[PDB]
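Q: What does the predicted 3D structure of Hydrolase look like?
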Amino acid sequence: MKAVLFDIDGTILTEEPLIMLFLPQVYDKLSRKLGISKDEARERFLSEILGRRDSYDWHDWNFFFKLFDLDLKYEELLERYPHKLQVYPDTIPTLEWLRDTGYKLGIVTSGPKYQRLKLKLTGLLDYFDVVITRDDVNAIKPEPKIFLYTIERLGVEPGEAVMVGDSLSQDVYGAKSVGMTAVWINRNGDRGYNMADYEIRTLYELRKILGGERV
């Protein structure tokens, strides 16, 4: 292998603490604007998210802010609360090891351009040779284009690339469909359906999968 490609959310970092922080503020502003309770505001907001699952806009917090005509921009939330972004303990030792061993490193995410800001604010950006988001290619996983465009910029063939992500449909199916090796990271004891070439609980397991030889 020559390159390892990564999803962001759930794979190298989580934005869950930030989400737990801003959602009450969304419900507050929704309650004010629409003249409903904060409980009803939560119901409507979460409903719309659930209703857009698997669509292009599903992965964009700004889509939902704008849907409800809120004066909220996720990029501003990110800049304001960058410590609420949590890097997994296994991430940086793995990125360092892959970089040291000679692998090209890519990001492939269905999230929009603020995904790149998340990497900058967590100090992860500089590890990667290429970062592709939905906004760069106007496509989401598992569309072949978002994968192919990434390995094209990395200068590698599909069969020389490994994809790591936590989504069976986006990451594993997406990567396998263009001829990549597909690794599923399963942090929460979920069901794998026998799909991925490898299943891991932690990014550290890549060392024994890839072996130690330089590339």
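A (community wiki): The structure tokens above were generated from the sequence. The chain has two domains: 1-13+87-215, 14-86. Residues 14-86 form one domain.
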